[PDB]
Paper text:
The mammalian global genome nucleotide excision repair (NER) factor, xeroderma pigmentosum C (XPC)–RAD23B complex (hereafter XPC), in particular, faces a difficult challenge. Once bound to a lesion, XPC recruits the multi-subunit transcription factor IIH (TFIIH) that verifies the lesion, which ultimately coordinates the assembly of NER factors, causing excision of a lesion-containing single-stranded DNA and repair synthesis that restores the duplex. The previous crystal structures of the yeast XPC orthologue, Rad4, bound to model lesions have shown that Rad4 and, by analogy, XPC recognize the damaged DNA site by inserting a β-hairpin into DNA duplex and flipping out damage-containing nucleotide pairs to form an ‘open’ conformation. In this conformation, Rad4 interacts exclusively with the two nucleotides on the undamaged strand without making specific contacts with the two damaged residues of the model UV lesion.
Here we present the first crystal structure in which Rad4 is captured on a single register of undamaged DNA using disulphide tethering. To overcome this problem, we covalently tethered Rad4 to undamaged DNA in a fixed register using a disulphide crosslinking method and solved a 3.05 Å structure of this complex. To our surprise, we found that this tethered complex formed an ‘open’ conformation that is essentially indistinguishable from the lesion-bound structure. Note that the disulphide tethering was made at a position distant from the flipped-out nucleotides and, therefore, it is unlikely that the ‘open’ conformation was due to structural perturbations from crosslinking. The overall root mean squared deviation between this complex and the lesion-bound complex structures is 0.99 Å for 2,388 main-chain atoms including both protein and DNA. In this Rad4–undamaged DNA structure, the DNA is bent by ~42° as in the lesion-bound structure. Our structure shows that tethered Rad4 flips out normal nucleotide pairs and forms the same ‘open’ conformation as with damaged DNA. These results indicate that structural discrimination between normal and damaged DNA cannot be the basis for lesion recognition by Rad4/XPC, and instead points to a novel ‘kinetic gating’ mechanism, whereby the DNA lesion selectivity arises mainly from the kinetic competition between Rad4-induced DNA opening and the residence time of Rad4 at a given site. In our structural study, chemical tethering of Rad4 on DNA prolonged Rad4’s residence time indefinitely, thus allowing even undamaged DNA to be fully opened. To our knowledge, the presented crystal structure is the first high-resolution structure of a nonspecific DNA-bound, DNA repair protein that relies exclusively on indirect read-out and makes no direct contacts with the damaged nucleotides in the specific recognition complex.
Residue numbers in the entry:
A (entry chain X): 256 to 308
B (entry chain A): 126 to 516, 525 to 632
The structure:
DNA sequence: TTGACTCGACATCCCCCGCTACAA
DNA sequence: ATTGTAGCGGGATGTCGAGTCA
């Protein structure tokens, strides 16, 4: 479960500006605690999510 | 006396988390870039960089009496390509900051604060870039892969993902400043592989940084060497993306010691990890298996069996295949009529040698009770394999797995009565220990339920708790009842507020 | 140069069904 | 008095950073 404004920044950092991953991921993981067990359990989900977007 | 540069298990566990998070993003970035490479608008402009003569070199006719000469022509093409790309690419930038090289945990933490300066790219600016020939070294290679692809060669994009090191336990982790940039760029993050149909191997091509083309056997020019170069480039996950949206972990090509040295640094070393990693790779692999996949796996297999025993004691901790005589656990013994599969020269004492066993020749033993907790008991007349010291003082006998056999608990009666222990429960430490005509129902209220219906049941002891005092206490996690009664119990449970 | 080894303070991984005593 | 309630794990093994030795 995640916003659509961050899902925007995240698709873009990941696709065209991964240099900037580091601070984005620092920010967002701090704003979405549950993301953590998500990412550990069901990465393939989080992946797929980044591909449509 | 104590400087002690170490962080909390909390921070450890976060770093592990962040390593995964950062990694997945990296590997997706590869996926997407590899798409953008296949851009058809781009392809059509890049084709015209490549003469017919060269084009022909990239697609030599099969030479049957000597395939080697076909590989040779293919190599000549790849070099003529490497040259004209040097020429296409006019302005080659320096990375702002670290590009996609590894960052230190501290650097990350601090990157929050200064949100710095980030242009935005998207897909057009990338395409436009590759066509003018303006960009950093990462872009340059990616274009090169575009060009080859537009010539209809099977040209992978390779990415050495450098997420932060989750084995770096250090609080302050500080780097040498001297020649920092010159040393970081010494080896590439991105490069290209190209498939030779004649020799059935993948050819390595780094047209922009090291500017060589290699057919890797045991050693590769691209794998970073020396303490300094590896602070920022720690080769762990080398990922190959192909035309058809394959995604394959090709680290074994580039890692000389994949199984001792490199494996300690991948998330892939514990079992959860491998399994997590495969999920990610599977998420990213949008094609179905080719025969090439098998020629490669065959390469990898051979690579993997020529690695052998490592040349040092530090490298045999937690090795997948191998273990020192000294690290065989107290609860392990050597499987009969086996012995060392090898020896290790111990650096820095003359003649001092260690015995190395294959992990496959070592047996794990468990005591009687220990087996029971795997739902297994001793086959009749079983000789013990070994004896140790337990704690007060007592000697606890251990047994091999084949000394033992499944416990088949008695079936329940017609009335659904379950056979109990001295304390009026049934012990279920493994699915096996659920009776055959019965099921286990786990729920804090299942006992309330069963008692209310007054159907016949028996509490499940599924484990023990340990606490202050030398005390142990059983965990009652549920109910064991006849299957016919399952539907009823589930209903009562669902309606527990109404009891 | 680099690995083996020691040493400092953490971690994991199995142990696998209790008892003394006070108080309203 | 009597009952409920509250107070009294750990030992082998393993892990990583550093400093010291050869």
């Amino acid at each position: 479960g995640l916003t659509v404004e961050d899902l925007l920044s995240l698709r873009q950092v990941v696709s065209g500006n991964p240099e900037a991953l580091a601070p984005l991921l620092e920010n967002i993981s701090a704003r979405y605690p549950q993301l953590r067990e998500h990412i550990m359990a069901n990465p393939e989900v989080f992946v797929s999510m980044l591909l449509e977007a | 006396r104590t400087s002690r540069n170490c962080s909390s298990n909390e921070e450890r566990k976060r770093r592990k988390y962040f390593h995964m998070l950062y990694l997945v993003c990296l590997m997706v970035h590869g996926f997407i870039r590899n798409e953008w490479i296949n851009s058809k608008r781009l392809s059509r402009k890049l084709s015209n960089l490549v003469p017919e003569k060269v084009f022909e070199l990239l697609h030599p006719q099969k030479d049957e009496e000597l395939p080697l000469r076909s590989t040779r022509k293919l190599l000549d093409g790849l070099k003529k390509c490497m040259e004209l790309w040097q020429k296409h690419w006019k302005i080659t930038k320096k990375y702002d900051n670290e590009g996609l090289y590894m960052r230190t945990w501290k650097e990350i933490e601090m990157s929050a604060n200064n949100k710095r300066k980030f242009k935005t790219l998207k897909r057009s600016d990338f395409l436009r870039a590759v066509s003018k020939g303006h960009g950093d070294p990462d872009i340059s290679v990616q274009g090169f892969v575009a060009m080859l692809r537009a010539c209809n060669v099977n040209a992978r994009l390779i990415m050495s993902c450098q997420p932060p090191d989750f084995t770096n336990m250090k609080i302050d982790t500080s780097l040498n400043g001297n020649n920092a940039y010159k040393d970081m760029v010494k080896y590439p993050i991105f490069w290209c592989e190209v498939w030779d149909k004649f020799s059935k191997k993948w050819i390595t091509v780094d047209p922009v940084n090291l500017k060589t083309i290699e057919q890797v056997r045991l050693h590769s020019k691209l794998a970073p060497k020396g303490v300094a170069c590896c602070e920022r480039n720690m080769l762990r996950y080398v990922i190959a993306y192909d035309r058809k949206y394959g995604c394959r972990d090709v680290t074994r090509r580039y890692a000389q010691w994949m199984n001792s040295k490199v494996r300690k640094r991948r998330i892939t070393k514990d079992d959860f990890g491998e399994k997590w990693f495969r999920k990610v790779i599977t998420a990213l692999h949008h094609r179905k298996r080719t025969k090439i996949d098998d020629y490669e796996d065959q390469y990898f297999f051979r690579r993997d069996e020529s690695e052998g025993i490592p040349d040092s004691v530090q490298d045999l901790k937690n090795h997948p295949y191998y273990v020192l005589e000294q690290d065989i656990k107290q609860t392990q013994i050597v499987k009969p009529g086996c012995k060392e599969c090898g020896y290790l020269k111990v650096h820095g004492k003359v003649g001092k040698v260690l015995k190395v066993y294959a992990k496959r020749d070592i047996a794990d033993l468990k005591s009687a009770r220990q087996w029971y907790m795997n739902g297994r008991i001793l086959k009749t007349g079983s000789r013990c394999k070994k004896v140790i010291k337990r704690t007060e003082e007592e000697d606890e006998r251990l047994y091999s797995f084949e000394d033992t056999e499944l416990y088949i608990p008695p079936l329940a009666s017609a009335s659904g009565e379950i056979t109990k222990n001295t304390f009026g429960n049934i012990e279920v430490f493994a699915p096996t220990m659920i009776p055959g005509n019965c099921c286990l129902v786990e729920n804090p209220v299942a006992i309330k339920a069963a008692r209310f219906l007054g159907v016949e049941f028996a509490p499940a002891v599924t484990s023990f708790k340990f606490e202050r005092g030398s005390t142990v206490k059983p965990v009652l996690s549920g109910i064991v009842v006849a299957k016919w009664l399952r539907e009823a119990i589930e209903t009562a449970i669902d309606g527990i507020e109404f009891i």
